[PDB]
Write a protein that holds these residues in place. Structure first.
Motif: not given
Lengths: 182, 12
Positions: A6-7, A10, A22-27, A161-162, B7-10
Motif C-alpha cells: 500500500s505505501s 500510494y 484513494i479509499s481504503q477499500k480501493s487500496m 473508490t472501488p 470507506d475512509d481515506d487511505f
C-alpha cells in the motif's frame, strides 16, 4: 504471506495523479492485484527456470513470463518498462538504494526476497530479475491508477473508490482480460 | 458515492 504494498501503491498514485486520493477499500483491492500478478509471474518464471534447467531465475525468465501472462499490447508495454528499469540500474554509478537506482517506487530488495520464495532448491534469483519484475508490477499499478483517477475526475470526485477501479478495468479490454484470468 | 461513505481515506 501476502505482502503489503500500500505505501508504494500510494507513492505511485502521487506521481500519476498528484491531486487525487484513494479509499481504503480501493487500496486493499490494488494490494490484492499486485500480489496476484506477482504470484502468476513468479510461478511461471520459476517454472521456466526449472523446465530449462537454469541455475538462476533471471530477467529473461521474467520477460518471457510477462509475455505469456499479460494480454495484448499491454505485455509489450510492460516489457519495455522492465527493460528500461534494468538499463537505468545498470548505468547507475551508485551507492544508492536498488529501487532508486532503477527509477522505481516499488521495493526492489523486498521483491527480490519474495521472488526467492518461488525458487526451489539450489535455484538462485538474479538482481536484474527482481528489478524487471518490480518495474512490471509498478507499471501495471500505474496503468490502473491512471485510468481509475481519470474515471474519478470524470465523476468530479477527488479520490479513487472501488467503482472507479471497476470503470478503469472494465473500460480497457486488456486489463479486463488480465483481471478475469487472475 | 453514498456507497463509499463508510470507506475512509487511505492515509500515507
Amino acid at each position: 504471506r501476502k505482502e503489503t504494498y500500500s505505501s508504494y501503491i500510494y507513492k505511485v498514485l502521487k506521481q500519476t495523479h498528484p491531486d487525487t486520493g484513494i479509499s481504503q477499500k480501493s487500496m486493499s483491492i490494488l494490494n490484492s492485484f499486485v500480489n496476484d500478478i506477482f504470484e502468476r509471474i513468479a510461478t511461471e518464471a520459476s517454472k521456466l527456470a526449472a523446465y530449462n534447467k537454469k541455475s538462476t531465475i533471471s530477467a529473461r525468465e521474467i520477460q518471457t513470463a510477462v509475455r505469456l501472462i499479460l494480454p495484448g499490447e499491454l505485455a509489450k508495454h510492460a516489457v519495455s518498462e522492465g527493460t528500461r528499469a534494468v538499463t537505468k540500474y545498470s548505468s547507475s554509478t551508485q551507492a544508492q538504494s536498488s529501487s532508486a537506482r532503477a527509477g522505481l517506487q516499488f521495493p526492489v530488495g523486498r521483491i527480490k526476497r519474495y521472488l526467492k520464495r518461488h525458487a526451489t532448491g539450489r535455484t538462485r534469483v538474479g538482481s536484474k530479475a527482481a528489478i524487471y519484475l518490480t518495474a512490471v508490477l509498478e507499471y501495471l499499478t500505474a496503468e490502473v491508477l491512471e485510468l481509475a483517477g481519470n474515471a474519478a475526475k470524470d465523476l468530479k470526485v477527488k479520490r479513487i473508490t472501488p467503482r472507479h477501479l471497476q470503470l478503469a478495468i472494465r473500460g480497457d479490454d486488456e486489463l479486463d482480460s488480465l483481471i478475469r484470468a487472475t | 458515492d453514498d456507497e463509499d461513505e463508510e470507506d475512509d481515506d487511505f492515509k500515507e
